[PDB]
Design a protein around this ligand. Structure first.
Ligand SMILES: COc1cc(C(=O)N2CCC(N3CCN(C)CC3)CC2)ccc1Nc1ncc2c(n1)N(C)c1ccccc1C(=O)N2C
Ligand SMILES: [Cl-]
Ligand SMILES: [Cl-]
Length: 125
């Protein structure tokens, strides 16, 4: 297939709030991962046309990426911190599902996930 539309990044019907946890997710967690050397491939949706991955969306029905997460945080899409944590987890898990233990992109995902866990460890109460 071609690519689906990217995940929604705004919901005008959903109320908005900026909590200490959401602040930390944007200013610390997302910022740290985004600026990591390995971030580029995760900064926008998987492009199955450009990467020549005809079966990507047969396998991955819940795509996610850090570009989407960034936009969601910057747009105040998330009401609960858990929504954002779940998106990071989906992004990493999809990479492990589609690819193989040896692969460069998997090594990159694992490094980013470790960093994610180190940062989320200090998520405020
Ligand atoms: C802006 O998005 C991307 C840019 C590039 C890219 O042009 N370069 C330039 C060449 C560069 N190399 C130069 C040669 N060197 C030895 C290694 C580094 C690596 C980065 C490469 C990949 C990009 N995007 C990308 N999105 C989602 C994917 C994914 N890739 N990978 C690699 C996957 C590959 C196959 C199947 C799935 C994925 C995947 O799960 N993710 C998350
Ligand atoms: Cl997309
Ligand atoms: Cl399909």
């Amino acid at each position: 297939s071609m690519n689906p539309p990217p995940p929604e990044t705004s919901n005008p019907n959903k109320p908005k709030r900026q909590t200490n946890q959401l602040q930390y997710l944007l200013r610390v967690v997302l910022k740290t991962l985004w600026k990591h050397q390995f971030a580029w491939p995760f900064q926008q949706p998987v492009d199955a046309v450009k990467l020549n991955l005809p079966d990507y969306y047969k396998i991955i029905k819940t795509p996610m990426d850090m570009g989407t997460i960034k936009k969601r945080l910057e747009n105040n899409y998330y009401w609960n911190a858990q929504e954002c944590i779940q998106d990071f987890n989906t992004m990493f898990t999809n990479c492990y599902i589609y690819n193989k233990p040896g692969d460069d992109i998997v090594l990159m995902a694992e490094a980013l996930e470790k960093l994610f866990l180190q940062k989320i460890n200090e998520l405020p109460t």
